[PDB]
Design a protein around this ligand. Structure first.
Ligand SMILES: *[C@@](C)(CO)[C@](*)(O)[C@H](CC(C)C)NC(=O)[C@H](Cc1ccccc1)NC(=O)[C@H](CC(C)C)NC(=O)[C@H](CCc1ccccc1)NC(=O)CN1CCOCC1
Ligand SMILES: *[C@@](C)(CO)[C@](*)(O)[C@H](CC(C)C)NC(=O)[C@H](Cc1ccccc1)NC(=O)[C@H](CC(C)C)NC(=O)[C@H](CCc1ccccc1)NC(=O)CN1CCOCC1
Ligand SMILES: *[C@@](C)(CO)[C@](*)(O)[C@H](CC(C)C)NC(=O)[C@H](Cc1ccccc1)NC(=O)[C@H](CC(C)C)NC(=O)[C@H](CCc1ccccc1)NC(=O)CN1CCOCC1
Ligand SMILES: [Cl-]
Ligand SMILES: [Mg+2]
Ligand SMILES: [Mg+2]
Ligand SMILES: [Mg+2]
Ligand SMILES: [Mg+2]
Lengths: 212, 222, 195, 222, 125, 204, 228, 196, 195
């Protein structure tokens, strides 16, 4: 996996790849790694597929129960802490998860929480998670500014996944984009790396290591 | 020390069309270098136009199929005979599998059927419950042989329109039931040639709005 | 986690704690606050196993806050440290022990004295003029042995602390991304923003 | 592998299947497991494929030089002695399991050699993963005073038992008949009971299907 | 364990134990709450048949549940301590999991739920 | 720490009507890290082509070793080495290191200049020859290549048609393997002309 | 977690036109020591089912007790216990299969391989296998241990597929079984010469043959073999 | 294996079963475990088939070379060569050999050589996995200076029991008779010895 | 040891190498030059097991210098790289292999082209536009993939290299105490003193 999400002037960008692997066997190229929890909350998946898929959909059920009980959408902090307290109960049992809980609320504003299976919970502006996280960091950090436009921020998120998809053997398939605003999350399409790499190479002039 | 797991070999394959869906699987059952049975079916009609196969360690496979079949039965009892949709079945199976997260069922599970718009549907699971809908999935011992052939022939991967300078891709289209069965039969004869645990017989289960039909074909027995 | 320091001077306790959170070959965060306020005049820094640290810190925080509400009274640093020690002492013989080391800096309002307690994950408590956990001690202790005096001011203590961080930044293998410094005295807890 | 050796009236016959495996994968569907040590001394080898080929070629080479040196036709016991002393020296690290058979001025002979350097004598023998399937047949149908045509039938039937029942064995049956006073006849693909059926579809692509980036003439000349 | 159903319906559809608990409240010293435009005030009566009291140490009638919520009561004094303790624990538990102090509605809902549970649980009044 | 799967890579060879084809991917990595997309695994010595998968340092070492040995062969024999003969040389050389082997999966391809007969062959890491009428496969995606070749292959394909078949076999196999890909090269080989084509493939 | 102590070797079986045949030798091995010689490893349940068991013998005796108790329990409040509501082969198997899998799932297995052979009420032949792992399968011929490697190849020459079952008489079928038992005595180091055989026919019913012996053995060619 | 050698009035007799195994599979049911190292010096082989064959081949070579130079070797000399190989290569060998021969001066002699490579001269010897089960029987039944027919019965009854209890032993009972008359080979089939 | 980078541009090769030498919990030195000049137009940086690195580097240096004196001629970068590869390829099957990874940057005077070769301890050689050894690649490669162009100047290359070091200094766990940068071109080898 490679997954990222960063905070900026216009809200939150969230970008992921779509590859699943069992050793060196590429099992799938079309895996949804963003979990839609509600119109305002997103969850990213890295690590064990079943662990992430199972417990993040479960997280959604707990968030729905919060808004039924409290007549109010759950905060990003509270949602992330439900997940982090759950995995802490299983600490040592062998769960494998690197997740990011992204969303906007009135009291918090745009917020990103890193939550992993050894119980770490961190608030932050930029996180990359997965086997190809370092490759994504390299491009993302070097090009990140707070003042990025929505158009440029979407591209940088896309371009960072592409960078990792290329170098990391266990990342690839396609890029799934998400923009999170005050109004909620917006889906910005599935982008196959097959076509996207050449399109980006030609138009941007990068990837000179590759035979054109 | 006692090892609670074993490998019973075999392979399975699911393809989806416009108004149908097939779920095939070879009938050979093995342990180590011995054949146990030349005809031991592992693709099952579970009711509500849902076919299912759980390939790998047969004892876990049978246990799972048995539990899902039973889950369908209790769904009818508890919800006024309501038809269990393929998407609902898939989610239910995830919970069956993940329920044993710390002592897993050692199987690749595939289910097929029609979605609620009448269109063909195939879902595939890992041993602990992760799932995904697809047009196409091969599972089991020869999954690594068959799956790349399916990418090339079903989803037209790496195929471009002739003369278009590799710019225009070959367009996606649904395959007829005739064309799909051709691909299934060829996939299994190829798999039988090159994989020792695959052979003896092929059993396909086709799923349309009219019900669940069966077709059987001989495979090489060496 | 990694570096946590503490210095007791004439009229205050000063806690410095590293900002880095590292996992694998990536520094995930460079602004992490490895401390919790237990009461208005008691502060606890912590370091150790991922997840355990914050889970333990917040659990102690909740218990001390509960006590304060129940009795309408603030526990002494000595009383808080003993409670924390016993919790770790229970933990070490549990099925899965908390792997957390803490420093507790407090100002006892009844005695009008600053107090610093060092407690490791086994539940080993000691009151000290200056303390550290992990590899940090191997550099700082000998340095403080030399330069520390019991009658120092808060400003003198911060300069003494700058000397420690400089030595760590020179000789430690890992980049710990600097420290967050906090002071505990008669007026409560406050953070130094420029260090 | 399944390999056998059977003694008859005026000589000896050996046989073998033609499957080569790579774990569960069939690497070669028609490999030659019958090896010529000398014109009238032949070898069937199971175990590590490179070791059987290499050890057979080395001893075959040394047998030729010995034959030329002594001005005599080579004996089976010479090959047997040279093989077993070589294999013993390497303490089983050379994984060659051989059935050695042939005719010489002394008469007709049949032996087996194991990787650690032990040898056995018999009228009928079988080695390899399918040796139990083959030996079951040999123990059921073998008798004293077999004819040429009866021994060929028995040998091939013992190989077929391995082909059908052992996953390690498959495809065709190779035979070599070594009769006294006659030239040895090597019968490559003596039986071919595993022919691949016609495919359902031609996978000939329209010309231009594959996207190309660069073309260039390669210089093979000087 | 002591299992007896003490709170039960009567022929006319009343739960007498719940209604007799209201009589205990009616016996208790008066308590009043008035909320203004920017504040709430809690007033409480203290009976004067008790002279030679030590007011420094005697339990106060108004209790802090958290730094932002208070609870006064009328009825059995010993019973009120149990509710206050539970409320105080839930207050800290809410801060721990939701990372936010309780609302007054939430804290009330919890205390009210505890009271209700004791009206259809066996062995308790 | 499995030598044959640290770097990654694949090679495949096929036969046709009076021709042979041999193809390979271009990736060289260090486990998950992709390092080079220009690492060709096919070499030739006269008209005899040799592809080598496995541990990259041994690939390089063996190429240099067989170039060495074929050069001395040509000087003494006064002719180019033929595919059948070269196949035997590779087998002998690998088995010489029986208890300290090169971690490789070589594949020979070429047309005999005297008979005109198309010839391919494959080996394991210690020298076992694997001859075939149809196709030979090698590398980290060998299971995938076996499945592609077994279904797609037919006999007596014309050079132009054979190119399509072998290229589709390699591409689709490479895409299902994490350690293979990053570009591909195909060699079409007729009696006295050899065409080399670079394929467009996905770069992830 | 167990290790087997006193063990039983192969159990072999096949279908024929009107029923099923099953056989197993009378040995109870204690490692390499051929300890006990009067052990019956075929256990009849009613007049329509025979359960053949290989593996650990203490566990075999436990299973014997379970089947014995099953017969008793089925007879309770059952007027048709010897008629329509008698124990079928399929009922007896499914019960054992359930137990074997439950025990493996508790990491404390019954260390056995089991073949249930019988005839159903409608005349249909029943023959199914189950082992310590809970793995089940059916085939025209079934065998355990060394039988799987040596008997099945011989029995499959008689009945290779389904269509070969009607064409196979009880005489031909028993001949093959008795032959297979001889081959196992040549080649299995933990086999004995004495065995039991059982036939369940849809017409003639259950026939249980005890104290059989392997005979017509070829040993004469051994005198000609000298040295190595 | 079950093997034994027994001295008697006219010389010595060697006896053995014919079973070779890989685990529980019988690789050879008609094995010849009684082998010639010299005209009238024979040995019984137990342990590894490969090791005992390799050793026996080397000993035969040594005694052939001995005979070329110094004439017929004694049975003691043969046992000394077996020992030298077994003792000096004790770390790399699994061989339990019984050496038996006939001199005209010394008559019948039996030497047993266990795993360690020690030499033990005895009136009769037993060895192999199946020997354990007949120590009691053989001790009670052996007598010095038996006749040929008595010794043949003693060996036949002994190996019959060894075969009956040991799974690693079976097949036919081969025997080799060493006397002044010459060398005689005997074989006994299951149908005879099983029902003793 | 740890961080070694290399970038080939239009007219030169640039090698950056970390300055830290760490042993246990102590940074023993912060000014270590992890490179040797093999010839006037060939430079080799190295990283790996302690002792092995310098022992190997100097051994190669001696051999190349010996060749130069014998033939009165400078070996091409390609020829030097092949010699180095073969030495490592021999080493890997020795009793005790050299655990050293190297980058070889050179300027071929006959071709008038800069050349960069990356060789690991197994003897795996590749010519590259840009290269790295160890964990450094996991950050730098994806960054260079984006920003690198084949026609860049030496000044553009140094800025590209500053971008890499900044990223490493942000995300790497260990303090590697900056880098020594050297340039190889038509005029030979020179060191950048202010980086
Ligand atoms: C990048 C793409 C790779 O690291 C990401 O990190 C993704 C995250 C996405 C998919 C949410 N991670 C994986 O792809 C993940 C890596 C992994 C594998 C195994 C354990 C932990 C992490 N892969 C999986 O989870 C795969 C996905 C399937 C194959 C589509 N699943 C498995 O490997 C499963 C279940 C693993 C497992 C976990 C815990 C207990 C038991 C099993 N294993 C198999 O299917 C077994 N295998 C299939 C191939 O045939 C041989 C048997
Ligand atoms: C029947 C068919 C099976 O038992 C026969 O016994 C045949 C004998 C005939 C072919 C001579 N045996 C095999 O086919 C044999 C089975 C086998 C496998 C592994 C070990 C021992 C026996 N197959 C082989 O020997 C193949 C020959 C190839 C297909 C041409 N070789 C391998 O599988 C090699 C084994 C090499 C080896 C090395 C060290 C010790 C022992 C054996 N294995 C690999 O190639 C695996 N791996 C692939 C990736 O690259 C590194 C090696
Ligand atoms: C009785 C049987 C026991 O005392 C006799 O002593 C005979 C003596 C005769 C043959 C001279 N002994 C055996 O038959 C002997 C038993 C044995 C087994 C292992 C070590 C020592 C003694 N059997 C053998 O030597 C067989 C003969 C072969 C089948 C022709 N060889 C094996 O069983 C080999 C031996 C490997 C070995 C180990 C230690 C030293 C030397 C050689 N074993 C295997 O092949 C293992 N096999 C691999 C495949 O998986 C199943 C086990
Ligand atoms: Cl032997
Ligand atoms: Mg990639
Ligand atoms: Mg097959
Ligand atoms: Mg790939
Ligand atoms: Mg016996």
């Amino acid at each position: 996996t490679t997954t990222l999400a960063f905070r900026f002037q216009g809200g939150i960008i969230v970008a992921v790849d779509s590859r699943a692997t069992a050793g060196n066997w590429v099992a799938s190229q079309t895996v949804k790694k963003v979990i839609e929890i509600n119109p305002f909350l997103l969850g990213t998946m890295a690590g064990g597929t079943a662990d992430c898929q199972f417990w993040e959909t479960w997280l959604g059920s707990q968030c729905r129960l919060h808004e039924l009980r409290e007549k109010e959408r759950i905060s990003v902090a509270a949602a992330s802490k439900i997940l982090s307290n759950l995995v802490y109960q299983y600490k040592g049992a062998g769960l494998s998860m690197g997740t990011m809980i992204c969303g906007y609320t009135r009291k918090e504003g745009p917020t990103i929480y890193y939550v992993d299976s050894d119980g770490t919970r961190l608030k932050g502006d930029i996180f990359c998670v997965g086997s190809g996280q370092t490759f994504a960091y390299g491009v993302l950090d070097s090009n990140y500014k707070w003042d990025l436009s929505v158009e440029d921020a979407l591209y940088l998120g896309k371009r960072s996944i592409l960078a990792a998809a290329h170098r990391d053997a266990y990342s690839g398939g396609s890029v799934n984009l998400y923009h999170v605003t005050e109004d909620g999350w917006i889906y910005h399409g599935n982008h196959d790396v097959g076509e996207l790499f050449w399109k980006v190479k030609e138009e941007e002039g990068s990837f000179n290591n590759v035979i054109g | 020390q006692f090892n609670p797991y074993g490998d019973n070999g075999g392979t399975i394959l699911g393809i989806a069309g416009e108004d149908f869906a097939v779920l095939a699987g070879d009938t050979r059952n093995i342990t180590d270098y011995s054949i146990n049975s030349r005809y031991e079916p592992k693709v099952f009609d579970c009711g509500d136009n849902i076919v299912m196969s759980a390939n790998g360690f047969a004892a876990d496979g049978d246990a799972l199929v048995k539990r899902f079949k039973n889950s369908v039965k209790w769904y009818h009892f508890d919800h006024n005979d309501k038809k269990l949709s393929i998407n609902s079945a898939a989610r239910n199976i995830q919970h069956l599998l993940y329920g044993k997260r710390f002592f897993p069922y050692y199987v690749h599970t595939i289910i097929a059927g029609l979605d609620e718009d009448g269109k063909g549907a195939v879902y595939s699971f890992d041993p602990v419950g992760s799932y995904e809908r697809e047009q196409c999935r091969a599972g089991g011992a020869a999954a690594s042989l068959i799956m790349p052939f399916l990418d090339n022939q079903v989803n037209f991967k790496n195929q471009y329109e002739p003369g278009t300078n590799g710019k225009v891709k070959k367009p996606l289209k649904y395959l007829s039931v005739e064309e799909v069965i051709k691909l299934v039969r060829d996939s299994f004869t190829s798999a039988t040639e090159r994989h020792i645990q695959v052979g003896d017989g092929l059993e396909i289960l086709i799923v349309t709005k009219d019900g669940v039909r069966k077709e059987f074909y001989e495979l090489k027995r060496d | 986690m990694d570096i946590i320091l503490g210095i007791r001077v004439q009229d205050s306790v000063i806690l410095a704690s590293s900002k880095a959170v590292t996992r694998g070959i990536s520094v995930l965060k460079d602004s992490d606050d490895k401390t919790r306020q237990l009461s208005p005049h008691t502060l606890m820094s912590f370091a150790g196993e991922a997840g355990d640290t914050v889970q333990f810190a917040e659990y102690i925080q909740a218990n001390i806050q509960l006590y304060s509400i129940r009795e309408d009274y603030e526990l002494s640093p000595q009383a808080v440290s003993s409670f924390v020690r016993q919790e770790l002492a229970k933990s070490i013989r549990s099925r899965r022990p908390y792997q957390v080391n803490v420093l507790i800096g407090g100002y006892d309002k009844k005695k009008n004295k600053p107090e610093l307690y060092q407690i490791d994950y086994l539940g080993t408590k000691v009151e000290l003029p200056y303390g550290a956990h992990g590899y940090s001690g191997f550099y700082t202790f000998s340095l403080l042995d030399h330069h520390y005096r019991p009658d120092m001011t808060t400003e003198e203590g911060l300069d003494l602390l700058k000397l420690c961080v400089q030595e760590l930044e020179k000789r430690m293998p890992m980049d710990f991304k600097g420290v967050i410094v906090k002071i505990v005295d008669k007026d409560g807890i406050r953070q130094v923003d420029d260090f | 592998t399944t390999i056998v050796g059977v003694k008859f009236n005026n000589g000896v016959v050996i046989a073998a299947d033609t499957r080569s495996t790579q774990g569960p994968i069939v690497a070669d569907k028609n490999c030659a497991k019958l090896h010529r040590i000398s014109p009238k001394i032949w070898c069937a080898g199971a175990g590590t494929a490179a070791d059987t080929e290499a050890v057979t070629q080395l001893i075959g080479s040394n047998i030729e030089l010995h034959s030329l040196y002594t001005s005599r036709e080579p004996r089976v016991v010479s090959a047997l002695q040279m093989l077993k002393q070589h294999l013993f020296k390497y303490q089983g690290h050379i994984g060659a399991y051989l059935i050695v058979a042939g005719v010489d001025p002394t008469g007709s002979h049949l032996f087996s050699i194991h990787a650690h350097g032990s040898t056995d004598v018999g009228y009928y023998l079988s080695l390899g993963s399918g040796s139990l399937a083959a030996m079951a047949v040999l123990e059921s149908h073998w008798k004293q005073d077999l004819t040429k045509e009866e021994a060929i039938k028995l040998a091939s039937d013992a190989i077929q038992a391995g082909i059908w029942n052992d996953l390690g064995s498959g495809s065709n049956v190779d035979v070599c008949v070594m009769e006294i006073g006659k030239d040895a006849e090597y019968l490559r693909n003596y039986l071919t009971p595993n022919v691949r059926e016609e495919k359902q579809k031609s996978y000939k692509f329209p010309r231009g299907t594959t996207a190309v980036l660069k073309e260039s003439i390669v210089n093979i000349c000087d | 364990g002591y299992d007896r159903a003490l709170s039960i319906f009567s022929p006319d559809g009343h739960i007498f134990q719940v209604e007799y608990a209201l009589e205990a409240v009616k016996r208790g010293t008066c308590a009043v709450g008035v909320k203004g435009k920017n504040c709430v005030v809690l007033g409480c009566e203290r009976r004067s048949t008790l002279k030679l009291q030590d007011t420094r140490i005697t339990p106060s009638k108004v209790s802090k549940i958290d730094s932002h919520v208070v609870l006064s009561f009328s009825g059995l004094n010993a019973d009120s301590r149990i509710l206050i303790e539970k409320a105080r624990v839930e207050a800290q538990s809410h801060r721990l999991t939701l990372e936010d102090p309780v609302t007054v509605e939430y804290l009330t809902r919890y205390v009210a739920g505890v009271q209700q549970r004791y009206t259809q649980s066996g062995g308790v009044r | 720490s499995d030598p044959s799967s640290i770097n990654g890579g694949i090679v495949v060879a096929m036969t046709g009507k009076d021709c042979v084809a041999i193809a390979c991917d271009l990736r060289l990595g260090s486990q998950s890290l992709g390092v080079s997309n220009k690492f060709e695994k096919i070499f030739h010595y006269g008209h005899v082509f040799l592809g080598i998968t496995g541990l990259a340092t041994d690939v390089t070492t063996l190429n240099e070793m067989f170039r060495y040995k074929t050069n001395l062969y040509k000087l003494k024999e006064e002719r180019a080495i033929e595919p059948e003969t070269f196949t035997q040389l590779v087998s002998s050389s690998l088995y010489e290191r029986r208890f300290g082997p090169y971690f490789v999966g070589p594949v020979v391809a070429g047309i005999n200049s005297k008979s005109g007969k198309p010839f391919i062959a494959g080996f394991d890491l210690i020298g076992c020859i694997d001859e075939a009428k149809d196709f030979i496969v090698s590398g980290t995606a060998s299971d995938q290549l076996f499945g592609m070749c077994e279904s797609l292959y037919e006999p007596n394909l014309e050079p132009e048609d054979l190119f399509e078949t072998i290229s589709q076999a390699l591409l689709n196999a490479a895409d299902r393997d994490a350690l293979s890909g990053w570009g591909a090269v195909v060699y079409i080989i007729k009696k006295d002309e050899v065409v080399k084509r670079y394929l467009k493939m996905r770069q992830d | 977690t167990q290790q087997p102590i006193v063990t039983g070797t192969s159990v072999i079986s096949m279908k024929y036109d009107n029923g099923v045949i099953i056989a197993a030798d009378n040995l109870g091995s204690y490692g390499s020591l051929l300890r006990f010689n009067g052990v019956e490893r075929l256990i009849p349940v009613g007049d329509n089912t025979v359960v053949g068991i290989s593996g650990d013998i203490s566990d075999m005796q436990h299973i014997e007790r379970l089947l014995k108790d099953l017969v008793t329990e089925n007879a309770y409040d059952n007027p048709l216990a010897d008629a329509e509501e008698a124990l079928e082969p399929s009922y007896i198997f499914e019960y054992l299969a359930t137990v074997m899998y439950q025990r493996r799932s508790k990491m404390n297995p019954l260390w056995n391989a089991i073949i249930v052979a019988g005839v159903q009420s409608n005349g249909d032949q029943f023959l199914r296998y189950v082992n310590l792992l809970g793995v089940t399968y059916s085939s025209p011929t079934l065998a355990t241990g060394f039988g799987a490697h040596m008997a099945n190849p011989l029995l499959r020459k008689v009945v290779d597929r389904e269509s070969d079952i009607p064409k196979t008489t009880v005489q031909v079928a028993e001949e093959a079984i008795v032959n297979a038992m001889r081959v196992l005595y040549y080649r299995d180091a933990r086999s004995s010469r004495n065995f039991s055989l059982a036939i369940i026919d849809k017409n003639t019913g259950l026939t249980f043959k005890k104290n059989l012996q392997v005979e017509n053995m070829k040993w004469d060619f051994a005198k000609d073999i000298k040295g190595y | 294996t079950s093997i034994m050698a027994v001295t008697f009035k006219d010389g010595v007799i060697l006896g053995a079963d014919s079973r070779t195994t890989t685990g529980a599979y019988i690789a050879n049911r008609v094995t010849d475990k009684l082998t010639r190292v010299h005209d009238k010096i024979w040995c019984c082989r137990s342990g590894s088939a490969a090791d005992t064959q390799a050793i026996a081949d080397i000993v035969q070579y040594h005694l052939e070379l001995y005979t070329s130079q110094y004439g017929t070797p004694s049975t003691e000399t043969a046992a000394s060569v077996f020992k030298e190989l077994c003792y000096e290569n004790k770390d790399n060998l699994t061989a339990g050999i019984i050496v038996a021969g006939y001199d005209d001066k010394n008559k019948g002699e039996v030497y047993t050589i266990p795993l360690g490579g020690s030499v033990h001269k005895l009136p009769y010897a037993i060895a192999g996995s199946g020997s354990t089960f007949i120590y009691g029987y053989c001790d009670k039944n052996f007598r010095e200076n038996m006749s040929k027919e008595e010794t043949v019965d003693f060996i036949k009854h002994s190996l019959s029991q060894a075969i009956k209890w040991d799974g690693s032993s079976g097949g036919v009972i081969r025997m080799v008779v060493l006397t002044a008359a010459g060398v005689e080979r005997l074989i006994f089939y299951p149908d005879e010895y099983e029902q003793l």
